[PDB]
Amino acid sequence: MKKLNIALLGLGTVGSGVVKIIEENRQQIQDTLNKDIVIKHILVRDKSKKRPNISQYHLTEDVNEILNDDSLDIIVEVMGGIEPTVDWLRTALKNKKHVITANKDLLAVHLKLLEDLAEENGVALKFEASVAGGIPIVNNISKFMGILNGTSNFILSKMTKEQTTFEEALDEAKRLGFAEADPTDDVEGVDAARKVVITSYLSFNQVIKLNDVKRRGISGVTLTDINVADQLGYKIKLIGKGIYENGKVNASVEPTLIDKKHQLAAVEDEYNAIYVIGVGDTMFYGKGAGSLATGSAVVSDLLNVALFEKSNFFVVVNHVKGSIENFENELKAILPFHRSLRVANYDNQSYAAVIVGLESSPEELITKHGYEVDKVYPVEGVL
Amino acid sequence: HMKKLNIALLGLGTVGSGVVKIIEENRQQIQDTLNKDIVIKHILVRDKSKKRPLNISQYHLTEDVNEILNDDSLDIIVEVMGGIEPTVDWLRTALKNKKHVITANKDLLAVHLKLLEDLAEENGVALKFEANNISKFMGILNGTSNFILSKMTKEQTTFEEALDEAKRLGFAEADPTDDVEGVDAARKVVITSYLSFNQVIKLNDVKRRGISGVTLTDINVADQLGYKIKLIGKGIYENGKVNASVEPTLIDKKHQLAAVEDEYNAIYVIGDAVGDTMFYGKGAGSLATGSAVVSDLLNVALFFETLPPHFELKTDKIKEKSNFFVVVNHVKGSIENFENELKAILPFHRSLRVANYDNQSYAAVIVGLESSPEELITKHGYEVDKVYPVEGVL
């Protein structure tokens, strides 16, 4: 019958899952689709390490053995990395091989360049990406907002629910394995920013760079912020956001007050969600694909290839003399025209304000009038 | 160079009219890009004489379905007519005549879908319908019912008042039975159970209660206990058997479903070795359904010249209890006495909380029972007003 010769680049949990899925379905893929899938090579970085299962496949540490094997039809890449992984896939596509990748490090620049190279060479490129269980697989979309990093969200949920400091919540997350020992990628919003890049590419068909994402992490969020927001009617989340207005994507990741009635406000712990605006709003909620589900998507893609607004702001000001009423009147005098304002006690000689309907952050303005602005967080879900 | 894709439409309501307009405004791009020319050769309608827009008048309308079913030039039949009889037999005939079928028929249940999918596969043609290891799903599957419960909750009105308001705003139809009695949601549970579990159940197998008995008191007492009330359509697949229901259900306020308000719908999915997932959004209008039909049409257009479920083995490293909200009335004595009696009579369970409901009326939320304590409470001399299931947890 028709042999489909494939190679895997990488064999972590995802690659091991792909293998097992192919194994336990080989007979039905054979019997039904008249295709015999042969895993001819598996590239691993270290043949002598352990996994995952001593097995029957040809393992190699030499990628050229795979890229120069002209009998191969499809390369499945689950290795990760940009260099030299991306060049490997460029070579594969140039050699007229279909590519299916679940590479988590790929950004939009990479995806576009591979998609183009694929089309140019008359072969498929299937990208398997998850941000919120499972995979997008999402109009015209004008805006998305997401909670895109489990660890950061877990930390904010723990602070909120158990009334602990960031430092205490981060240690707890480390203890439970949610946070790594160096948790920077999670708590500084970098992981979420990568997902904003990919989601902006799939939603808007625009390539932005990782450093075009205006990014602030959660390490400066305090219990005071959480409790003041709470009394104002908001939760605090690390929100990854993209807005596509007038040919331009504005993308960000930062601590954001979210109205408690918004679906995103309810997304707690290590759960993720992507909320899409265009038609009514839509949302996908979940932890975001496990190895087994990602593996499943890969094999399905394998079988398919075989077949063929104003802005709102929360502003914290300190060293304020005088009463909250006086502060409120002063803000009313200095702000440009806006829809609404509320003020709250924050700390000793410190007030917070939620301001609805500005074109940009009033931080510099409030600063230029002689106030000490601690920080400003955007406010979402308003009405 | 181009090849004509000859289609026929069965029915021309809002959905069929949308399909036509969508095909019209995309004909040139479908032509120019996919090298296929879609020709709507026949449209079946009930009444060929009724006034119609200028655009419709240029298509060949017929009242005779055999004209369509005996036209061997047709590649695809698009059914948007509704009905089971005779519509289902029409589609059986089409499939047997080697025609692809795309249906947005809202009256189709799992029995019909399976019989058509099989017949399609048997005849080597596509069947597309618009209308994992999953073990359970729970959904808010009817916009109108959910809107009513949200309005009762947020605005503190009676069911009757909230239903009238929903009628005024066009959410509820003038005869809203299908919505408020949970029939629509029950149909969706049937379909969702078929797609989630690959099991056919009948509509009559869905234990169904509507929302017309939910009161503001239920809502406010649930609220004080930490719950919202929703109309939940639910399917649980345990030991080869699907247990399916639609009914008013208390949902812990911290559960993602609890936040789904007004006309929005959601399907919350639970699976054996995976996190929970949920999809949230409004029910499709005619335009979106029309859009789905055309996209399915274009996908089938690439059938030009199979079916599997991938099975998973995890080397990748007790029946669930039930929870209940019980309202009892004509109760003499104190809430403490009621609580103590329940503690004495209930079989083993994980927790019990009681609340005032009305004059000589109490409610209890009981977590972790094997089965409804209704008969048991009844046999101990309590008048049970009603019992709702309770979801979300720990």
Short mmCIF file of C-alpha atoms in Angstrom, two decimals, chain A residues 203-343:
data_model
loop_
_atom_site.label_atom_id
_atom_site.label_comp_id
_atom_site.label_asym_id
_atom_site.label_seq_id
_atom_site.Cartn_x
_atom_site.Cartn_y
_atom_site.Cartn_z
CA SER A 203 -6.07 37.15 14.09
CA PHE A 204 -4.96 40.09 11.94
CA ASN A 205 -2.51 38.53 9.49
CA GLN A 206 0.05 41.11 10.60
CA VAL A 207 3.58 40.36 11.75
CA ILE A 208 4.72 42.22 14.81
CA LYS A 209 7.96 41.65 16.73
CA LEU A 210 8.18 40.45 20.29
CA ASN A 211 9.62 43.74 21.35
CA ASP A 212 6.72 45.67 19.75
CA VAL A 213 4.58 44.18 22.53
CA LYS A 214 4.42 46.79 25.32
CA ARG A 215 5.06 44.57 28.25
CA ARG A 216 4.89 44.85 32.00
CA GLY A 217 4.98 41.86 34.31
CA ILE A 218 3.17 41.21 37.60
CA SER A 219 5.93 41.56 40.19
CA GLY A 220 4.85 45.08 41.08
CA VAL A 221 1.19 44.15 41.69
CA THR A 222 0.35 44.44 45.39
CA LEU A 223 -2.40 43.23 47.60
CA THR A 224 -3.41 46.87 47.98
CA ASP A 225 -3.95 47.08 44.18
CA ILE A 226 -6.00 43.90 44.31
CA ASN A 227 -8.21 45.02 47.19
CA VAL A 228 -8.75 48.55 45.92
CA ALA A 229 -9.66 47.10 42.48
CA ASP A 230 -11.97 44.65 44.22
CA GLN A 231 -13.85 47.45 45.98
CA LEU A 232 -14.09 49.33 42.67
CA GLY A 233 -15.65 46.24 41.02
CA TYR A 234 -12.55 44.79 39.28
CA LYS A 235 -10.13 41.90 39.38
CA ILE A 236 -6.50 42.22 38.36
CA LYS A 237 -5.19 39.94 35.61
CA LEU A 238 -2.17 39.85 33.40
CA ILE A 239 -3.84 40.57 30.09
CA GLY A 240 -2.29 40.06 26.66
CA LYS A 241 -4.05 42.27 24.23
CA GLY A 242 -4.05 43.14 20.56
CA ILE A 243 -6.09 45.87 18.91
CA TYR A 244 -6.12 46.22 15.13
CA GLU A 245 -7.08 49.81 14.25
CA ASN A 246 -6.29 51.63 10.96
CA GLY A 247 -3.77 49.16 9.55
CA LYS A 248 -1.82 49.06 12.85
CA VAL A 249 -1.65 46.42 15.58
CA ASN A 250 -1.23 47.75 19.09
CA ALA A 251 -0.15 44.88 21.28
CA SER A 252 0.50 44.74 24.98
CA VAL A 253 0.80 42.56 28.01
CA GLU A 254 0.32 44.11 31.42
CA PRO A 255 -1.52 44.07 34.72
CA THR A 256 -5.03 45.16 33.92
CA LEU A 257 -8.19 45.81 35.98
CA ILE A 258 -10.99 43.74 34.51
CA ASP A 259 -14.63 44.33 35.40
CA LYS A 260 -15.83 41.43 37.57
CA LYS A 261 -18.73 40.67 35.22
CA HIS A 262 -16.41 40.09 32.25
CA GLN A 263 -15.90 36.42 31.38
CA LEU A 264 -12.16 36.94 31.73
CA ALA A 265 -12.53 38.08 35.33
CA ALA A 266 -13.55 34.57 36.33
CA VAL A 267 -10.49 32.83 34.82
CA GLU A 268 -8.47 31.67 37.80
CA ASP A 269 -5.34 29.80 38.65
CA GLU A 270 -3.47 28.15 35.82
CA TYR A 271 -6.34 28.42 33.43
CA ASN A 272 -6.00 30.51 30.31
CA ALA A 273 -8.50 32.15 28.01
CA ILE A 274 -8.70 34.06 24.77
CA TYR A 275 -11.53 36.50 24.36
CA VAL A 276 -12.18 37.68 20.82
CA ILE A 277 -14.10 40.75 19.68
CA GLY A 278 -15.33 41.50 16.12
CA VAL A 279 -20.84 39.81 15.69
CA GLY A 280 -20.89 38.78 19.37
CA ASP A 281 -17.82 38.24 21.56
CA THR A 282 -16.38 34.75 21.82
CA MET A 283 -14.04 33.03 24.25
CA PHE A 284 -12.07 29.84 24.52
CA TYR A 285 -11.06 28.76 28.03
CA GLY A 286 -8.73 26.01 29.13
CA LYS A 287 -5.31 25.24 30.52
CA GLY A 288 -3.85 25.16 27.05
CA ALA A 289 -2.89 22.02 25.30
CA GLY A 290 -0.99 19.24 26.98
CA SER A 291 1.51 17.10 25.16
CA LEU A 292 -1.10 14.54 24.46
CA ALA A 293 -3.46 16.96 22.82
CA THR A 294 -0.69 18.68 20.85
CA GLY A 295 0.49 15.26 19.72
CA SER A 296 -3.07 14.56 18.65
CA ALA A 297 -3.25 17.75 16.58
CA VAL A 298 0.07 16.87 14.90
CA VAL A 299 -1.15 13.45 13.82
CA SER A 300 -4.43 14.87 12.53
CA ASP A 301 -2.52 17.49 10.52
CA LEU A 302 -0.34 14.61 9.36
CA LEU A 303 -3.35 12.68 8.11
CA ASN A 304 -4.81 15.77 6.42
CA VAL A 305 -1.57 16.50 4.59
CA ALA A 306 -1.52 12.81 3.57
CA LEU A 307 -5.03 13.06 2.02
CA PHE A 308 -4.16 15.84 -0.48
CA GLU A 309 -12.31 53.24 21.31
CA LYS A 310 -11.22 55.46 24.20
CA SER A 311 -9.10 53.93 26.95
CA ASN A 312 -9.70 53.53 30.66
CA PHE A 313 -7.13 53.85 33.38
CA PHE A 314 -6.46 53.03 37.03
CA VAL A 315 -4.07 55.66 38.38
CA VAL A 316 -2.32 55.47 41.72
CA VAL A 317 -1.01 58.75 43.17
CA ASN A 318 0.98 59.15 46.38
CA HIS A 319 2.25 61.97 48.65
CA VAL A 320 -1.05 63.67 48.16
CA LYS A 321 -1.88 66.35 50.70
CA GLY A 322 -5.49 67.03 51.54
CA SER A 323 -8.66 65.09 51.32
CA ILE A 324 -9.99 62.61 48.78
CA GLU A 325 -12.65 65.17 47.79
CA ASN A 326 -9.98 67.77 47.08
CA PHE A 327 -7.98 65.21 45.07
CA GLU A 328 -11.07 64.35 43.10
CA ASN A 329 -11.77 68.04 42.34
CA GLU A 330 -8.15 68.60 41.33
CA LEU A 331 -8.31 65.59 38.90
CA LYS A 332 -11.55 66.96 37.52
CA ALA A 333 -9.76 70.27 36.87
CA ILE A 334 -6.63 68.85 35.27
CA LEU A 335 -7.87 65.88 33.22
CA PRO A 336 -8.99 66.50 29.68
CA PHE A 337 -12.66 65.79 28.96
CA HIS A 338 -13.54 62.20 29.86
CA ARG A 339 -16.65 60.11 30.53
CA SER A 340 -16.29 59.38 34.21
CA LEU A 341 -14.14 59.34 37.29
CA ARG A 342 -14.11 57.62 40.67
CA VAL A 343 -11.56 57.88 43.40
#
